[PDB]
């Protein structure tokens, strides 16, 4: 009566039977823009059922020798669904997110992931020059739908050690107790609205801490999906198409 | 006008003092605030968040393997699994937590602590693990029948996966200067050995090593006193 | 950068002292951790090279008490007090601050 | 009667804290079903096993102070943020783009928080580079973004028609001003992901990455007031004290050494650990 | 803990040699592997290093375009060498080991020679 | 509690804060667990 939970947004529910709990990020629900904050003087065009539903990304494989993966939000939705056709026409943007990571296993496997949400996530270059100087490419700072791999998971590509990285919102995926993790993030940004294509707010991270071990004979391909979904999103400021 | 003699203290520049100074822009109204979630008000809402210790800080482990303690099915009982100190502000395992990075900006900590363990093993494997703690004065304990004198919590694996030892505040002084050496060994605080209680029993065709992740935090009566300037910084240039 | 071992041929007598030095260098204190590296290396003429004093002063395990080495700035010395019948190889100095890692020339011993 | 479906709070609660928390006594428990020690760290919330529920404790009235940990008293100490070198007799003046990312003692503190908002307070200590300290006149302008940066020792930007300026000697006690909050956003931000413009961004070396435009705050220019060119070398040491500060969204602290001013690079050839190594795992000291 | 290279074979101008080694006795996905050559009666030279997990090849600038490394996951190195040999490169090619998180000293163990 | 100029940012440090609420960083869960119960039940 506390494990089983069904989340239903829009027209696409998600049921699960071995969950743990639901984590709000910094204790505040995602809400609309009150009129002491808004600075645009044109009416925002908020849809309700078209762009508030769970979109499923592509599933990475988890092996013996894996390092990590990371995505950037809301970069990953700029090509799929109606939300990909309302972040190209409209200049401004404002939303929340509601993440979900499935990874199921048997009873004789072991291992544990770490699902976090890091606001304002900057990727840093990896070269010992002081001026030319190395810089990350465009296919690394905005990976797209797939999401690249970490090169150094111990320092998170930023010189921040992993052991201190529970100050962010997070849940564990411990493969003996649960098999799904859920974070609900409100809208954290300085200016009230935001551009939608350049300023990507935050970034999901999955880092396997205790690596996968299994005895001989079990199934060897354990995949990992993501299921995100916006909440209370509103747009504004129409123009022509720029991808 | 009014007669006013001066004092020592004239014409100095003390850094940590708060006085007024003449503004440069008369009649300035700043850009107004909006509601942004997750506001801090103190640095005691950042000492109460459990982060990951670095216990396996030995010669042969490198990388993500440093963060976790290994267990395995022993041949005998009574054996030892890991051991470390309680000194936020001494080199060792506490240097990679938020307590160990904030209690180096300050001197003279106080109050309790807590250590949370999490077991990342399989599902069908059980066991028990004593978790001891002993106040200072002697060396590291030898066998288990000596380390069951101090504070200890016997922990059993099951559907739950966490026990949280609360290391109490047993000290003569009201604070502890958070530095070690020869003359400052008067402010040390003892060892947190993990002992096997019985064994680690495993069914057939199941992996034969599990990994215990240790964590760490601070309790509710945690206070800090004197702001100093830290020592983990490194520079020899101007960052050109 | 570059290194210059100052004595390419030092000819000591047993129960004597040595001073093999590389005067020529850059600042060589960078990599920004402090920690100027400057490792030393024997090479007996039939085997692979081996370690010696690994930072400016610290000894590596297995190295005897005779191998002493110090220095600062751009001056670095080795001092061994009893040249035995084993300490006869070639001495190299390896810096590790900047990116192209350089080993310097070398230093012989013959008596 | 019309279309029907058109018609169709937080968790935290603030508590004042004056002292540290107290401790209420307890006794021994011999009872099944009420277990406070067992937790679940998978749910993300930290444990809450207070020590009244583990061990038998005594009633302790606590009187320690929790005044010197709030962030107003934590940042209100002034540290170095910049050094301007001045050689005369060979252009005559010197500039310094305002950027507090340079010196590492105050950079490492201000990266604990993501979005900040304060009011600075500067102080300019100026010495000749051989401890002479002879009386001259100095002028410190302040060029906001857009005004022309002065080109010569005696061009016509040095007239101070609009923008501020501080005349002070070398023998007086050092100057001090109080710069207010000057950002077009709602708050300063230190970490800005995302390119600043539109267009198409290359693959090899995009040096535009992560440059936040909400912090480009101008230039600080200084010359020596004379007609004849005097012959002297100087340094200034601009200190900065923050006050009235408010912060948001904490994040962990840098652990690797720094390499550049604007960009947060590390060096992946040699990575330093956090904890220095010991001999084995089964011994303490 | 041993590093066992390949047997020495002489090659004339216009081929590759692909000298290997095999890490024996430790965890192979936790160490760099450098490559150091010894000119005849002369000084040592550094070539470059391969990181055993995440790739991350780095050379000198005196050896770019030649001696492009590879990597194997079955406990084996790049086994790689120059594509275009000259007459002077009849040297001896060592291989070494370096800990990932730094221990403040490089090049602890050494290999054989070709 | 005194200010000699007619602007508000030129003053000294203001009054003490004395407030904190750590429940938005320790326990931000929906189903609020208590101290004396099994948290996965
Ligand atoms: C006579 C007064 C001359 C000095 C006037 C300096 C005014 C500019 C100070 C504004 C506050 C500092 C500028 C912003 C702070 C950091 O550098 C940026 N946030 C960098 O991200």
Notes on the protein architecture:
The structure holds 6 chains of a larger assembly. The termini of chain C are far apart. In chain C, the strands form three sheets. Chain C has a three-stranded antiparallel sheet with strand order 3-2-6, with no helix packed on it. In chain C, strands 1-7 form a two-stranded parallel sheet. In chain C, strands 4-5 form a two-stranded antiparallel ribbon. Chain C is an all-beta fold. Chain C has strands spanning 9-10, 39-42, 50-51, 68-72, 75-79, 92-94, 108-109. Chain C has one domain. Chain D has two helices and eleven strands, in the order βαβαβββββββββ. Chain E has one domain (1-114): Sandwich (Immunoglobulin-like). In chain E, strands 3, 4, 5, 6 and 7 form a five-stranded antiparallel sheet that branches. Chain E has a two-stranded antiparallel ribbon with strand order 1-2. In chain E, β4 and β5 (58-59) form a beta hairpin. Chain F has one domain (1-41). Chain F has no helices and one strand. Chain F is rod-shaped and about 60 Å long. Chain F starts with 18 loop residues before the first strand and ends in a 21-residue tail after the last strand. At the A-F interface, β3 of A face loops of F. The complex binds sphingosine. Sphingosine (SPH) binds next to loops of chain D. Residues 98-100, 120, 122, 140, 142, 164, 166, 177, 179, 182, 188, 190, 215, 217, 220 of chain D line the site of sphingosine. Chain D: Belongs to the picornaviruses polyprotein family. Chain D: This is Genome polyprotein. Chain D: It is found in: Host cytoplasmic vesicle membrane; Host nucleus; Virion.
Features:
6 chains of a larger assembly; D: 285 residues; mainly beta; Jelly Rolls; three-stranded antiparallel sheet; 2 helices; elongated; E: 114 residues; Immunoglobulin-like; five-stranded antiparallel sheet; two-stranded antiparallel ribbon; globular; binds sphingosine; virus/immune system; CVA10; immune complex
Numbering strands along the chain, what is their spatial order in the largest sheet of chain C? Answer: 3-2-6
User: Mind telling me the C-alpha Rg of chain D?
Assistant: 28 Å
What would you call the quaternary organization? 6 chains of a larger assembly
Give a short account of the largest sheet of chain C.
3 strands, antiparallel
Helix content of chain D: under 10%
Biggest sheet descriptor of chain D: 4 strands, antiparallel
Tell me how many strands of chain C there are: 7
| Count of all domains of chain C | 1
Tally the helices of chain D.
2
3D shape of chain D: elongated
Overall strand count of chain D: 11
**CATH topology title of chain D:** Jelly Rolls
Briefly note the structural class of the backbone of chain C: mainly beta
One letter per element, helices H and strands E, the order of chain D comes to: EHEHEEEEEEEEE
Q: What class would the helix/strand composition of chain D place it in?
A: mainly beta
